[PDB]
Design a protein around this ligand. Structure first.
Ligand SMILES: Cc1cc2nc3c(=O)[nH]c(=O)nc-3n(C[C@H](O)[C@H](O)[C@H](O)COP(=O)(O)O)c2cc1C
Length: 147
């Protein structure tokens, strides 16, 4: 199976998360394509992928709390080929904030509205993902199993 991992990361937490997930998948036998949201084009992004994992950090704001690099993707999610696609979301945040990993909720909700198949509840990481290594690995483990 082929998996696409797209992440929006500002300080590198979600990026570390994405790489950890990517390794787990790889070791399981998937061909994984991991990409920074800043370098992708939305049109047909998901074509040909068996699994798509989208991740992004959350930023407190009155309009849009998504990580800046992920915004363009999010705004054109309807052109990615999400209908009937098996997907799962992840993101880093901080429980000291009102909307803890609110970006995860937003992405899941929009994917659900576009007809994607959410395979598992999103991975919401509080603080340093290097300290949540087990959680990431375990979650990656569960999404493979839901596929
Ligand atoms: C100014 C600021 C605002 C933040 N706002 C939120 C927030 O609304 N919700 C959340 O869960 N985390 C929030 N966080 C924490 C970031 O989402 C958290 O640091 C995350 O690890 C960053 O991930 P990244 O390196 O992949 O971008 C904020 C952090 C900063 C510095």
């Amino acid at each position: 199976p082929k998996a696409l991992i797209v992440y929006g990361s500002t300080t590198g937490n979600t990026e570390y998360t994405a790489e950890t997930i990517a390794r787990e998948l790889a070791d399981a036998g998937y061909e994984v394509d991991s990409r920074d949201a800043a370098s992708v084009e939305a049109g047909g992004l998901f074509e040909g992928f068996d699994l798509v994992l989208l991740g992004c950090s959350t930023w407190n704001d009155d309009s849009i709390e998504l990580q800046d690099d992920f915004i363009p993707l999010f705004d054109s999610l309807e052109e990615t080929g999400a209908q009937g696609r098996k997907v799962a979301c992840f993101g880093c945040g901080d429980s000291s904030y009102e909307y803890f990993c609110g970006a995860v909720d937003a992405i899941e909700e929009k994917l659900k509205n576009l007809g994607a198949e959410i395979v598992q509840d999103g991975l919401r990481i509080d603080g340093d993902p290097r300290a949540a290594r087990d959680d990431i690995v375990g979650w990656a483990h569960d999404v493979r199993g839901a596929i």
